[PDB]
Design an enzyme around this catalytic site. Structure first.
Site, PDB file in Angstrom:
ATOM      1  N   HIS A 119      37.565  33.917  48.316  1.00 49.90           N
ATOM      2  CA  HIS A 119      38.294  35.075  47.448  1.00 49.90           C
ATOM      3  C   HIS A 119      39.039  36.065  48.010  1.00 49.90           C
ATOM      4  O   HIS A 119      40.351  36.708  47.903  1.00 49.90           O
ATOM      5  CB  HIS A 119      37.674  35.404  46.265  1.00 49.90           C
ATOM      6  CG  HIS A 119      38.599  36.053  45.115  1.00 49.90           C
ATOM      7  ND1 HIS A 119      39.107  35.071  44.102  1.00 49.90           N
ATOM      8  CD2 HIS A 119      39.147  37.135  44.570  1.00 49.90           C
ATOM      9  CE1 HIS A 119      40.198  36.558  42.796  1.00 49.90           C
ATOM     10  NE2 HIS A 119      39.545  37.348  43.604  1.00 49.90           N
ATOM     11  N   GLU A 120      38.682  37.319  48.660  1.00 53.32           N
ATOM     12  CA  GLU A 120      39.020  38.320  49.332  1.00 53.32           C
ATOM     13  C   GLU A 120      39.627  37.919  50.368  1.00 53.32           C
ATOM     14  O   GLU A 120      40.856  38.625  50.310  1.00 53.32           O
ATOM     15  CB  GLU A 120      37.475  39.217  49.957  1.00 53.32           C
ATOM     16  CG  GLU A 120      36.630  39.729  48.522  1.00 53.32           C
ATOM     17  CD  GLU A 120      37.942  40.247  47.830  1.00 53.32           C
ATOM     18  OE1 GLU A 120      38.667  40.942  47.462  1.00 53.32           O
ATOM     19  OE2 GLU A 120      36.817  40.136  46.651  1.00 53.32           O
ATOM     20  N   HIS A 123      42.806  36.903  49.359  1.00 53.63           N
ATOM     21  CA  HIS A 123      44.129  38.436  49.562  1.00 53.63           C
ATOM     22  C   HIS A 123      44.537  39.104  50.413  1.00 53.63           C
ATOM     23  O   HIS A 123      45.885  39.283  50.661  1.00 53.63           O
ATOM     24  CB  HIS A 123      43.142  39.982  48.395  1.00 53.63           C
ATOM     25  CG  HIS A 123      43.387  39.068  47.067  1.00 53.63           C
ATOM     26  ND1 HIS A 123      44.159  39.622  46.253  1.00 53.63           N
ATOM     27  CD2 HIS A 123      41.653  39.895  46.434  1.00 53.63           C
ATOM     28  CE1 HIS A 123      42.898  38.831  45.221  1.00 53.63           C
ATOM     29  NE2 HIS A 123      42.363  39.567  45.233  1.00 53.63           N
ATOM     30  N   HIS A 129      46.521  36.943  41.730  1.00 57.35           N
ATOM     31  CA  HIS A 129      45.986  36.615  40.943  1.00 57.35           C
ATOM     32  C   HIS A 129      46.129  35.302  40.400  1.00 57.35           C
ATOM     33  O   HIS A 129      47.595  34.916  40.006  1.00 57.35           O
ATOM     34  CB  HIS A 129      45.542  37.459  39.999  1.00 57.35           C
ATOM     35  CG  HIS A 129      44.170  38.001  40.863  1.00 57.35           C
ATOM     36  ND1 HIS A 129      43.777  39.907  40.293  1.00 57.35           N
ATOM     37  CD2 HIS A 129      43.163  37.934  41.408  1.00 57.35           C
ATOM     38  CE1 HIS A 129      42.241  39.651  40.641  1.00 57.35           C
ATOM     39  NE2 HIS A 129      42.570  39.252  41.613  1.00 57.35           N
TER      40      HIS A 129
HETATM   41  O1  LIG Z   1      39.034  40.528  44.628  1.00 59.09           O
HETATM   42  C1  LIG Z   1      39.413  40.935  42.888  1.00 59.09           C
HETATM   43  O2  LIG Z   1      40.245  40.587  42.621  1.00 59.09           O
HETATM   44  C2  LIG Z   1      38.885  42.310  42.825  1.00 59.09           C
HETATM   45  N1  LIG Z   1      37.081  42.141  43.071  1.00 59.09           N
HETATM   46  S1  LIG Z   1      35.998  41.745  41.549  1.00 59.09           S
HETATM   47  O3  LIG Z   1      34.511  42.063  42.299  1.00 59.09           O
HETATM   48  O4  LIG Z   1      36.314  41.958  40.479  1.00 59.09           O
HETATM   49  C3  LIG Z   1      36.099  39.934  42.207  1.00 59.09           C
HETATM   50  C4  LIG Z   1      35.357  39.034  42.559  1.00 59.09           C
HETATM   51  C5  LIG Z   1      34.923  37.757  43.211  1.00 59.09           C
HETATM   52  C6  LIG Z   1      36.543  36.714  42.073  1.00 59.09           C
HETATM   53  N2  LIG Z   1      35.946  35.414  42.229  1.00 59.09           N
HETATM   54  C7  LIG Z   1      36.547  34.705  41.321  1.00 59.09           C
HETATM   55  C8  LIG Z   1      35.984  33.274  40.944  1.00 59.09           C
HETATM   56  C9  LIG Z   1      35.324  33.114  41.980  1.00 59.09           C
HETATM   57  C10 LIG Z   1      34.815  31.173  42.203  1.00 59.09           C
HETATM   58  C11 LIG Z   1      35.966  30.397  41.789  1.00 59.09           C
HETATM   59  C12 LIG Z   1      35.487  29.096  41.480  1.00 59.09           C
HETATM   60  C13 LIG Z   1      34.889  28.594  41.394  1.00 59.09           C
HETATM   61  C14 LIG Z   1      33.351  29.651  42.235  1.00 59.09           C
HETATM   62  C15 LIG Z   1      33.660  30.867  41.797  1.00 59.09           C
HETATM   63  C16 LIG Z   1      34.464  33.589  42.465  1.00 59.09           C
HETATM   64  C17 LIG Z   1      35.338  35.178  43.399  1.00 59.09           C
HETATM   65  C18 LIG Z   1      36.699  38.226  41.504  1.00 59.09           C
HETATM   66  C19 LIG Z   1      36.781  39.029  40.712  1.00 59.09           C
HETATM   67 ZN   LIG Z   2      40.594  39.159  43.271  1.00 55.79          ZN
END
Ligand SMILES: O=C(O)CNS(=O)(=O)c1ccc(N2CCC(c3ccccc3)CC2)cc1
Ligand SMILES: [Zn+2]
Ligand SMILES: [Ca+2]
Ligand SMILES: [Ca+2]
Ligand SMILES: [Ca+2]
Ligand SMILES: [Zn+2]
Length: 167
Positions: A119-120, A123, A129
């Site tokens: 995910h990171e 970015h 998003h």
């Molecule tokens: O990075 C940001 O925006 C802020 N940091 S945070 O820590 O709030 C944050 C970190 C990770 C995710 N994820 C989104 C869903 C995901 C996923 C997707 C499909 C299948 C399995 C898992 C796995 C990571 C969302 C927000």
């Molecule tokens: Zn994010």
């Protein structure tokens, strides 16, 4: 999908990363493994390639840190923000920081390092998003019952290829 404002992107296809330090929570081989699998996910669907530096400044500097750690967004203790990363560019841009007040895992039960790293890195590559609840780039963390069922959604693929094109 969504991109960042003013669409930051890398204007080069060969990127470098450095893992500057390591979490207490996992052996180093487990963290290397998580980040290289996270790199690979994006590599497959673009013309980008990544290689590792063990010293110097890489494009994507990866590190583990708690609370205030040298940018405008201190971490916040256990829970809440797990990690964050910056859009393409020089310096802190591109970098990804993981909150080491989380307990990082390899499994489907805790906060999983691979899913968060993937995910990171989205970015770090210019993606923001998604509204698709299926997407990697969805804004709210969750994990999977079975990690072997992980895949990028079409939305993530459409987003990233809008920047860099297909392989
Ligand atoms: O990075 C940001 O925006 C802020 N940091 S945070 O820590 O709030 C944050 C970190 C990770 C995710 N994820 C989104 C869903 C995901 C996923 C997707 C499909 C299948 C399995 C898992 C796995 C990571 C969302 C927000
Ligand atoms: Zn994010
Ligand atoms: Ca950087
Ligand atoms: Ca936190
Ligand atoms: Ca930790
Ligand atoms: Zn940070």
């Amino acid at each position: 999908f969504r991109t960042f404002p003013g669409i930051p992107k890398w204007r080069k296809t060969h990127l470098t990363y450095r893992i500057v330090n390591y979490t207490p929570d996992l052996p180093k081989d487990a963290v290397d493994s998580a980040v290289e699998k996270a790199l690979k996910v994006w590599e497959e669907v673009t013309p980008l390639t990544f290689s590792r530096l063990y010293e110097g400044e890489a494009d994507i500097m990866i590190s583990f840190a708690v609370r205030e750690h040298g940018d405008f967004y201190p971490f916040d203790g256990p829970g809440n923000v797990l990690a964050h990363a910056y859009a393409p560019g020089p310096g802190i841009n591109g970098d990804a920081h993981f909150d080491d007040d989380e307990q990082w895992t390899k499994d489907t039960t805790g906060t999983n390092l691979f899913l968060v790293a993937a995910h990171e890195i989205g970015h770090s590559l210019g993606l923001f998003h998604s509204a698709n609840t299926e997407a990697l780039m969805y804004p709210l963390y969750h994990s999977l019952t079975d990690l072997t069922r992980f895949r990028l959604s079409q939305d993530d693929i459409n987003g990233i290829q809008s920047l860099y094109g297909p392989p």
